[PDB]
Amino acid sequence: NQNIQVYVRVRPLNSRERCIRSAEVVDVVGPREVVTRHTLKLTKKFTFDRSFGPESKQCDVYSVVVSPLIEEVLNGYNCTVFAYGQTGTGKTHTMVGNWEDDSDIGIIPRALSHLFDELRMMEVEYTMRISYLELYNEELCDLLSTDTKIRIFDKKGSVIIQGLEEIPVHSKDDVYKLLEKGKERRKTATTLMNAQSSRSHTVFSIVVHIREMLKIGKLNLVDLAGSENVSKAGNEIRVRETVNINQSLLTLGRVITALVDRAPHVPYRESKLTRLLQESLGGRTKTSIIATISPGHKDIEETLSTLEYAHRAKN
Amino acid sequence: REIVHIQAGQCGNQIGAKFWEVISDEHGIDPTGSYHGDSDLQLERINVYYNEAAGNKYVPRAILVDLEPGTMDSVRSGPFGQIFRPDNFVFGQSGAGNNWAKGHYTEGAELVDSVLDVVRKESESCDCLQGFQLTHSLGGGTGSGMGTLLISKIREEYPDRIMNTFSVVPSPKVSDTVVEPYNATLSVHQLVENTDETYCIDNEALYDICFRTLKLTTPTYGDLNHLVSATMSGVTTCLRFPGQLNADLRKLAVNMVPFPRLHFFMPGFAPLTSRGALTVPELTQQMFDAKNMMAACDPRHGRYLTVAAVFRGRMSMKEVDEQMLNVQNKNSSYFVEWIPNNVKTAVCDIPPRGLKMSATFIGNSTAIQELFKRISEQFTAMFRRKAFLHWYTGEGMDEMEFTEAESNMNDLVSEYQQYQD
Amino acid sequence: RECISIHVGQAGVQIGNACWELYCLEHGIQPDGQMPSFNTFFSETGAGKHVPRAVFVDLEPTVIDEVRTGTYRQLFHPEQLITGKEDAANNYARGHYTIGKEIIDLVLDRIRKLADQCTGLQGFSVFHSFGGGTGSGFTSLLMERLSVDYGKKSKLEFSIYPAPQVSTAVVEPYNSILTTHTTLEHSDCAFMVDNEAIYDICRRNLDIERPTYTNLNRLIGQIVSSITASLRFDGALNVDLTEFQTNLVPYPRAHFPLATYAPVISAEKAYHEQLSVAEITNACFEPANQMVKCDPRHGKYMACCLLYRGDVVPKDVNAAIATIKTKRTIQFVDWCPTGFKVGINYEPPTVVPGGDLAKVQRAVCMLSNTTAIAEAWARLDHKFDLMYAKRAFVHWYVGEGMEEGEFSEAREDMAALEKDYEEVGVDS
Ligand SMILES: Nc1nc2c(ncn2[C@@H]2O[C@H](COP(=O)(O)OP(=O)(O)OP(=O)(O)O)[C@@H](O)[C@H]2O)c(=O)[nH]1
Ligand SMILES: Nc1nc2c(ncn2[C@@H]2O[C@H](COP(=O)(O)OP(=O)(O)O)[C@@H](O)[C@H]2O)c(=O)[nH]1
Ligand SMILES: [Mg+2]
């Protein structure tokens, strides 16, 4: 579609955040616009497509997002969503949630509900094969089974991955186990701060052929890492991780600006992700960018940097 | 501050033969390896290109590699064949016969382990590595075959070094072998992704330059390799000799690469004269001129992104930079709009021997999509017939890989048309 | 009563070749360090050697070896000639973070060593550029620690401003916006110099159509001698550099003056005109001798220093400073009635044996703060803005450790500087 789905969700307060008794800095108006204060003391406004506050239900943030997104995958086209944000409890509650209670699960099992809601809704040849691959140290790692290379196969734009392990599963808890199988082989880097720093841009692919003729549907779940600074990291190996993370984001940040200006040649081959994800962002597709955040006064410079990644120029 | 130099292919080893002939005379180094120059500046930066061995010996930082001995058989027997220590002559028999997969995908790759250890022991001897430097062609078997294979392992091993190479491009004039568009499209599948820069060079433009500028009758391979080697020293000697604006190759690299895939350049020597004035406005007009473009492209048909103007000699700065400014003033359409100053200067205090001044035009134009159109159109009609392809399919190459090579090449064409207007 | 001098970048180091070229000629000091037959910028040894209070640091090892193999290598102590091994590569991220971190710990101790050797430190003056890699990156990292450890000292910056038309690197506007954010927070008074006007003064008033970097820095070195090396000597009305910031900088962020120098003349034409103090002060306020390519008529003035040299009667200056308000085509703010600080040192202007400036008896250096500079910032901001619109060349920085939100962030603090220079003139 012509209008890019630029979103931002605010996480609620934690109990350890209430031990500090820190004041909130976020002001919710509606589902469209949410004012983000800044005390230094200039309250700024950041207008986006839709914004979710700290007191928002996990089905509710999904139904605005994942429920218009799902059917265009099966109706010919494909659709893509990203998950951009730093390490935080708001990041996990967006994707998988807690899961629990069949409604308060994240965007993934609410989709996995609505996938298997569609399997019982109408009856076609549902074949749900799924791969799950990361980008760790500029190579595409098979998180399911890494036993040498991940090879890309291209007649107009359709990119297939070789070396990935597509698993034809047909129950909701299956990929729920596979994501646990994904995290155990996913590379993390131990550190004094954020040791669980498993920082990798990571795709999660749901391709479902729904043939009768031939009918295909591909869904992509992008797990973007947060943009970091090498100075604030203070680490003497981690920098090669860090500078390749940020440079991959900006090339991804370049091509979306190359989309909205209706530029003739959108570049793709410069970064491996958008080369591996060419047609998913480019076509008559609907791209939802997600920025998670935690309120208070701690990650203020981390908060305002996400809004520059979320701000688009319009007529 | 040391650069590794490797020469591969029948082309590049001929080029590097005349190249080290120049640098030896640049410092008064004898063909044996003894210093007989008269300047400390000849003496100061020898380590950048040489290893000082005992008895004031100087072995060049140079590795010769091929699959056929015959070129190195001529070189080691010929002049400046004794300046090398004989360890560096890493080769074998059974040449590729201008087959890319023989040079890259198979046999030629078996020699690579013998090469990289000689690269390793040379790079271990460097106290501060600075970059790598290759000499090859695109349409050659033992030039492009190992030439892509060697740089792939090195950039994996040295992710921080500058990966420059001097690359001879196939012409619209000569088809020496007919498989020359097949070799180019496989190499560009590696050259975009594993180097930081390169230089596109046609034989045909050097045929034009020795004809219309040097007025020489029969331009032999000695003359053209003499001609391209002047820009090779023209790039690096500002880092070595003192200058006003001394600029690293990385200072070129951050100045000439606006987008991480566009790093192809059209070098050009400024004071090209026959034996029948010399100022900075004299130089820059020869820099601007399309006849001095050592690639077979019309740069006025293209548009420029960035221009590097390396200079050599005692020149007043305002005399350069105002004259540099006038180049953007006359044809402001020829440069891209989103870059306000499109040209970088660099002035070395020391000129080469004989001439009091020399400059070096290094440009990144949108004319290079034309030379990419020659290879892709030559790729298309040959791939339809699959004409003389069964050698490579017999060597283990898939048609999708060739299809993914040309589309990635076609990706590179679509950038320059996008940024031209 | 002493001050330190750091030189970084290829620019400010090569300027510092010309600065210490004057100070040895100021007192008959040889390149050795002794006078054949004053304790402000030197340290005298027991053997009569005088070591300068200068440290020369660069990432490139080229220009440092030009000093310690050419002349004046017997002058500086070799522990001061700090030398890197690999270039800055014209990257701010290299100089500010990536490369310069591994040298600055050696660098900061030498400043800490020399400040311990000093007593009564007036502060220090650094020498760099704006469009550089070492002289924008590393000097940004350098004045960070100095603002921490020496919070009470005067920090002076003789930066080279990126010229509008003549520029020597494509990434020069990309590094100026990064430099000014580090500059605006901690620098107390930073001078800019545009290279085009150094050409413009020399091709018209000095009649030299061949200027080199040597010929430019003799003018630049002559001004720095007029600010400091004269004013640490006796005069009729001496002014210290500590009272500068309260005389010249009216606000927190207005500390960007323009220096110039009026008696710039060739050897021949000084025989014609006997230079009085009246015509020299008018020659400071010429739009064509501003040393930074801006239109002073389009800018209001706030404050203006006039530092003098040689035989000068102050009674003539009071008539001459009244003459400027009599010749009022300048715009002056209604904030400040009397932005004219006079300072007259008794020392003459000195000649360099090889330069083309004649032996005048009197010399005037003029510092000034005008609102014409927002026009100058608007040029460099446009040059930035199109490159960030394309995300041009940014992968050499985010491939080195910067964030894309930061270049947007640093432009706003540059844009916040543009609000202030609009505010200071409009007020009534
Ligand atoms: N007046 C004068 N200016 C110079 C001189 N050398 C360089 N510059 C100016 O410095 C500006 C850019 O700063 P550079 O010193 O070149 O910065 P760089 O290219 O990164 O080199 P380094 O800072 O040493 O790493 C150029 O635009 C030049 O005009 C000099 O010797 N004299
Ligand atoms: N200038 C120059 N070019 C050469 C020379 N020898 C070969 N070439 C070029 O190299 C190309 C052939 O590549 P080549 O090196 O022979 O293939 P290889 O032997 O398999 O590596 C031809 O297009 C020639 O133009 C030479 O001595 N001088
Ligand atoms: Mg330099």
Tab-separated table of C-alpha atoms and ligand atoms in Angstrom, chain B residues 244-245 251, chain C residues 9-11 14-15 58 60 87-88 90 129 131-135 160 168 172 195 213 216-217, ligand 1:
chain	number	residue	atom	x	y	z
B	244	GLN	CA	50.196	19.705	1.379
B	245	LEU	CA	47.035	17.589	1.448
B	251	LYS	CA	40.708	9.253	2.584
C	9	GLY	CA	45.076	17.832	12.296
C	10	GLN	CA	47.246	18.418	9.261
C	11	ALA	CA	45.990	22.010	9.212
C	14	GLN	CA	51.227	23.093	9.753
C	15	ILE	CA	50.001	26.389	11.152
C	58	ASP	CA	48.390	13.621	14.648
C	60	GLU	CA	49.116	10.581	10.272
C	87	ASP	CA	45.395	8.036	9.290
C	88	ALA	CA	42.151	9.620	10.467
C	90	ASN	CA	38.640	11.901	7.211
C	129	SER	CA	40.008	22.764	11.278
C	131	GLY	CA	36.372	19.822	7.537
C	132	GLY	CA	39.031	17.445	8.820
C	133	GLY	CA	39.304	13.984	10.268
C	134	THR	CA	41.935	14.486	12.945
C	135	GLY	CA	41.257	18.183	13.437
C	160	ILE	CA	39.649	26.686	9.947
C	168	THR	CA	39.083	20.198	-0.515
C	172	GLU	CA	33.619	18.699	4.974
C	195	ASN	CA	40.793	29.993	3.313
C	213	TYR	CA	49.984	26.918	2.652
C	216	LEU	CA	48.722	31.667	4.251
C	217	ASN	CA	49.932	30.637	7.691
D	1	LIG	N1	46.155	27.336	6.074
D	1	LIG	C1	46.365	26.032	5.955
D	1	LIG	N2	45.293	25.172	5.871
D	1	LIG	C2	45.498	23.846	5.749
D	1	LIG	C3	46.779	23.337	5.708
D	1	LIG	N3	46.690	22.000	5.585
D	1	LIG	C4	45.386	21.650	5.551
D	1	LIG	N4	44.641	22.790	5.647
D	1	LIG	C5	43.179	22.888	5.652
D	1	LIG	O1	42.599	21.862	6.428
D	1	LIG	C6	41.336	21.554	5.882
D	1	LIG	C7	40.899	20.150	6.258
D	1	LIG	O2	41.628	19.758	7.390
D	1	LIG	P1	42.782	18.658	7.224
D	1	LIG	O3	44.008	18.991	8.037
D	1	LIG	O4	43.094	18.502	5.758
D	1	LIG	O5	42.055	17.350	7.783
D	1	LIG	P2	42.357	15.872	7.247
D	1	LIG	O6	42.205	15.736	5.753
D	1	LIG	O7	41.472	14.897	7.975
D	1	LIG	O8	43.866	15.632	7.718
D	1	LIG	P3	44.084	15.330	9.273
D	1	LIG	O9	43.210	16.246	10.088
D	1	LIG	O10	45.527	15.511	9.663
D	1	LIG	O11	43.679	13.898	9.514
D	1	LIG	C8	41.520	21.708	4.389
D	1	LIG	O12	40.354	22.242	3.812
D	1	LIG	C9	42.666	22.682	4.243
D	1	LIG	O13	42.209	23.901	3.714
D	1	LIG	C10	47.857	24.196	5.800
D	1	LIG	O14	48.998	23.753	5.754
D	1	LIG	N5	47.651	25.549	5.914
